Design a protein around this nucleic acid. Sequence first.
DNA 1: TAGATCCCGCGCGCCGCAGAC
RNA 2: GUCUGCGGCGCGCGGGG
Lengths: 397, 400, 919
Amino acid sequence: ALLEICQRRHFLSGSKQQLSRDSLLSGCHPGFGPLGVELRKNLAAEWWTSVVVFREQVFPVDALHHKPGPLLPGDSAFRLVSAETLREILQDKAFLENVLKTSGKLRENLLHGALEHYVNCLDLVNKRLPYGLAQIGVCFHPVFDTKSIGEKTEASLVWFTPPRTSNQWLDFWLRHRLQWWRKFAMSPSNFSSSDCQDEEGRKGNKLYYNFPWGKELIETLWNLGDHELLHMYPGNVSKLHGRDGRKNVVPCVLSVNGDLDRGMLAYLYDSFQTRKKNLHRKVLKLHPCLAPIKVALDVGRGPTLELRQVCQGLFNELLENGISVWPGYLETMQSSLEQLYSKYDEMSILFTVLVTETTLENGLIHLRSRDTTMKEMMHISKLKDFLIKYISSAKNV
Amino acid sequence: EALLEICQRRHFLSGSKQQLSRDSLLSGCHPGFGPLGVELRKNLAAEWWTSVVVFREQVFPVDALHHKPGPLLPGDSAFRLVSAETLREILQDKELSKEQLVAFLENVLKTSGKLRENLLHGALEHYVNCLDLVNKRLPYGLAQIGVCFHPVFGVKSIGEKTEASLVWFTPPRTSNQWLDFWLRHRLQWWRKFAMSPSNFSSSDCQDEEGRKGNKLYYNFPWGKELIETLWNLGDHELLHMYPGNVSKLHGRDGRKNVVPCVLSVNGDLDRGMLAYLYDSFQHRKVLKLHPCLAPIKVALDVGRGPTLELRQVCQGLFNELLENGISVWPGYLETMQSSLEQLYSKYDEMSILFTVLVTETTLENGLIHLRSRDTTMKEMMHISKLKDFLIKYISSAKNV
Amino acid sequence: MLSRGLHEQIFGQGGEMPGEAAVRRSVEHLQKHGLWGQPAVPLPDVELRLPPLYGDNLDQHFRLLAQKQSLPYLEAANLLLQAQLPPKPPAWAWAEGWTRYGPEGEAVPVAIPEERALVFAVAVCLAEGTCPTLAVAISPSAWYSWCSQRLVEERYSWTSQLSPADLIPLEVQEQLVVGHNVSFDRAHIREQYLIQGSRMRFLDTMSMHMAISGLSSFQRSLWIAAKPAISSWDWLDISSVNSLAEVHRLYVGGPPLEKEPRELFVKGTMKDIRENFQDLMQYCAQDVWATHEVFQQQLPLFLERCPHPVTLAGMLEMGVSYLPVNQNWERYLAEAQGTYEELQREMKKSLMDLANDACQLLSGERYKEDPWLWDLEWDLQEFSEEEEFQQDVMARACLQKLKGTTELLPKRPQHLPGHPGWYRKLCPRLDDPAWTPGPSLLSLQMRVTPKLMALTWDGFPLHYSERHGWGYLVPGPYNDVDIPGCWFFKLPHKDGNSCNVGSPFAKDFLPKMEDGTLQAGPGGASGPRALEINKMISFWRNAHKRISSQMVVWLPRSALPRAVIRHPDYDEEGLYGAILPQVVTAGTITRRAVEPTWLTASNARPDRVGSELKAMVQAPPGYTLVGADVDSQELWIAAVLGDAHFAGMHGCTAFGWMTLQGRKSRGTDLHSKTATTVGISREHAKIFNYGRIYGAGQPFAERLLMQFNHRLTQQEAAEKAQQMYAATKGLRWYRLKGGTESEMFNKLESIATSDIPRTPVLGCCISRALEPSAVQEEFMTSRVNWVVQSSAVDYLHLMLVAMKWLFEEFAIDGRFCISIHDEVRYLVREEDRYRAALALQITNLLTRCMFAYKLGLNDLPQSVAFFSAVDIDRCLRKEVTMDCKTPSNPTGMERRYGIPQGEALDIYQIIELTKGSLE
DNA sequence: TAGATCCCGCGCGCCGCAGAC
RNA sequence: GUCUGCGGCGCGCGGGG
């Protein structure tokens, strides 16, 4: 259960040594390592391709990090410790931004941005009621400790569909999200969804992951029948009405928002495996389509050299071929190959390629796979093709 | 002038009501960009990351917090929009009722949490982690692209701009060589995606923090606009970040431990995208932008044929394009059918590399009409061979 | 009233001759078994003025209705029977549509066959969809042919209404149609998919053959093979195996029919049809001619076997069944197949991950001590420098020039070299089968998926060494059933499961997933879930071929009546279709409707992907399904027949007493109330009981008990004769078999071995293949089953004729009887739905009363006089309030909740003027 | 009970083919 | 003058309904 050791050893977790689970979940953690950043970027790209590139009638949505609109006191427990926190009984030597209208606000979700951009999306489209707005970005939320501002990466997709099929569209979106969570996951059973009802009676689905501590919500879907959209732009309804069919009606917006950082943490937890196995092997069996480092080039005994430039050339060729290769032939003095393989696997290294003294003539280099602890011999040629094929297999299925 | 209106009409830019003037677009106060602009910015960011991260060998990704918090921030020193109260953003607090503090006892000198306008502070903070990541490599560096907020002047608004900041660590002896190499790489990047590389220019500046620095400018139609700034900051900033740290900040170059020299290069991604769009724009209003950064690559349309067959062909083409990773504009499902010339003009205004039309002839024989905006030439191409031709064109554009 | 609970009627004279001796016998019988003294709850009395009966009795009333319904179809049948047929024309026509062949084969185009009777045959091209390609028909006048218009080369792309044939006039008399498997041709006749009813009825020589010397399923095998086991074979010369050629051979002595050797319809292309048009048309006409011969030899014999007009009227009505689908059948198929694919891929991924994790025993030789994969061979067969970016084209072309020995060494199994043999067998080649990284091409069907998961019990190799899953699998050579395992295999012992291939077995593994000593175990995450996947997947895996590829013909807007249109629920880009079940009216030795997919026992069950098949049979808007399942139909029929044999009172036998008075809760009911307490559990005691009224014995009961759970033969029905002793105490001697317990089965036994018609109600004769008079034989079990199941068929026939009479006497816009396992549904207009309930109740009153009128019972109990609940719904589900597994819920589709009525429907009458609501 | 054996997958042997080493 | 794996042709056994 001491998975934090692996996160600290590899550049996949935050820099701070003390990173509580609650702090990481709330987004108040110091950050994430380069491997974590790469994994988050890959997950975001996959989600965008599935929802934006794959789904038709869906367009990107951009929301400002902070809302300069006057609005009113927001979801802040303390109103800048000004209205409720007055220095002394009076100390009237004076709002100092006490009025919310006086200054901007820190956006917590893209729902306001989606509502604002709904009119623009409808105008751009050919009056079609079915429309989509996606936005992936960092949202800041207040976390109270017995206060702080925690930034978490979240992806929000809002689909405006006719009210008649609003429930069907919401169900389809929930099913698609559940399938996506199951895909690229070692144990899709862990990720599930649960029906929930809002305070006003709005129904929706919330996605949860069964972490070892317990079930934690990682996504939430809410369907609004032109309530928030009408509130944002209540002056006129003709311009806010979409043409689902022969007549124009007020669209219903189903917004699904998922915490990208929470999703990455859940995926990392799922990668690790747990009794009666009788074979302990610390390995992060992350999906190849999302693994940070796909190919790890290495060096032989070091007695003959020629491996550093080989690794550099392999990395350059992979970059020209769209494959990311970590040039591991520069570092030396390891004195052991088992430790290097274990580190690469813990770094989510799909394959490890080693060049020996027999690499010049009869270039059969050694290949090691994280999934199977068995050695292979592969020709120097077509290695990039093999990596590309493996990546394509991971991405497609 | 007309370029902004054309972009807004084709959904390239955001609403012109708030960003009617070019100043808003140049600064971070602009109200975002349109879907075509968003796609172009994403493509440019991906290309920059590949050139800086993929091309680099010892460079690893570095993540920096959006806002730097704590009371540690100096009193009224580089404190812009320093609220950290989850509400309000005061860019300037020159005149305030100093009863207990500038604004309040709790909200003054303790709660700053001001979003950094550059990633240099984040790079300095994460240099400790990056050294371990690069195995104490003195020539290592860290690059990251993110949104930076700056104050713009009654009330001082906060303008957000997407900028890419790269901190390269090199030995002080070779620091000048590293700066020159970075300048050459920046020139190469400017000439890679610019129709006229002569428009991009570089200037040399001197400052106390950095003796030699490079500033990149683009010759926009309105005038020269700064798009990149390079500062060869010394080890003083590292010493300030780490007080009394011995052999920690210093990097190992040539088996010798010495204080690394960190050069910070910051480039405005939005400014570069705007400059590229302006360069592309120039009787027919068509923006001859680079295919790699073009928001729209291939557009599929159905006309002059069976409705069901045309819809099926368009769906198949879109699925094939998606499987290959090339975005396809959903031209189908539109019943307006105003005119072929209008569709071509819209595609040109949408930065569409090529226009694809499928008709009854395509259903009969599989050959569809392919038109090139840059060449304004229309030919007949096989549906199966259309993807191969697009891939070949993309490869040629990438490697020219 | 009363006398242990009876209803009050409208029909009937004085009568009332119970008999003092009969009452004394019944009372002293009810003294034992159940308790004679039960106050019971008197049900509310119902005052109902029945519609005017005809004749002097109920039997004559039923005989008059059925004659009125069967007169014109019998007239048409006799018109065909007394007809002469000219020779076949020399050359068939090529024109589309219908072509009539006058004298000397003169071909003239005609619109439709303007004949009162026909013998019809249709041929379909399996490769090109399911649209028909050519049909041949005959009447007393001449010959007719039809070409289907697909012989031209044009695109049609399915989903049409003029694709099928045309056989009904414009009606501006009764249009009998005769055929073999005439349901299949009815699926193509057209004017049968219309929701508005039509007067054409169909006579299937398959149905008549099953009635007239049909064959059982255990007898079909013995008939095919001969094209304790000692049997008499005098039934071979009267019985066939239901094939057109064979039926023609059996009923007609002549040359055997020739068959098309190339089989251009089942395995061929439309071009082959165009080339061989004349030969295929000749074959179709030969089939029609043999059908006419068989019909001529069948119809008078048919009417001899089933003299009651009611049987013929019921067969005519049951030949027109209708299943609306309404735009969600395709959606149900699509979601079901998508879920199937997703679950299959998830299970495959889990299996590949298990295989990958199974490789860690190679790293330490630890496979030998592993009880799971010990027997596997597990042999490890093998099977600076500048980047120099140049000569890429030469390197690429070297691979193409590497044909011969350069590529011979790698071949298929080269990737991942040095791995154990089994893992390499799972791994495909690099080039041909793509790469599919990992041990792909792995499924449950392989012998290696066991020992990668599951292995419950003690030792579970699942190796097909003439024994499949080997193991004693119970307590007490060495390590045969030991928990550590790793058997020496010194000598095979097939202990524990000693039945081997003798037992019929079944998918008892699927319900044994829940406990039953069948789970993965040490896996924790991916092991048990694969078994969960199999449990959820097996049904659709097995049945997606049948449920998919169902013939759905979507009616256009012009083909719908004014009721479906102008309704609140309409359009929404909606497709209102129909499925004719292709159901043979008589498809068994008993004349039961037989359909492999629609007429099986299935319902919407959680953890089953392919379930809710019965759902999505949704009535068109403005119409609804009014239907009911008879409350223990076969149980009550056995009880009443047994009660009639014992005395004149209904509850005399103590088995009909429990069927009448016993209740599910606070009541001695055989189903889910008692027979679980002596037995094991409910929903298995139901199956236990239904097997005894259909005929069974200690062997079948013991095997059923063994299937229920893991119990030895002593705890099974070998030492346990108590179920046999306390129920079905037959074959008792020294009594000058009859009863001697709750159940009176001797009435069925005396019915079977009597050589008479043997049907107590309608007098439908048994098949000549089973008659003792035709052949002395010991197929008694099938005949005992036949008596009750054909009495059930006769109950259905009575219900059908009564419902038709009530719908025609009173203008109730309903039709299309669908019968599913003793349940009957009628698609009726909404405005009359309550009447259709009342009529249905009245039908259940008359039908039971008819069942009462025969066997000598002039009164009927109040409890069974009416249906417990009349299900009025917009869908076909077992209960009015149920759900499904694949969708979120029924309200994901437009499915509301119905109502089961009860005695509320009794606040009306059957005339159009009910409570003044009409007009 | 009605209770099934045409299509549909698990295995084996058997005979015929390239061809360097 | 071989034996490593691939293309049609026989056998056995359950399994759906």
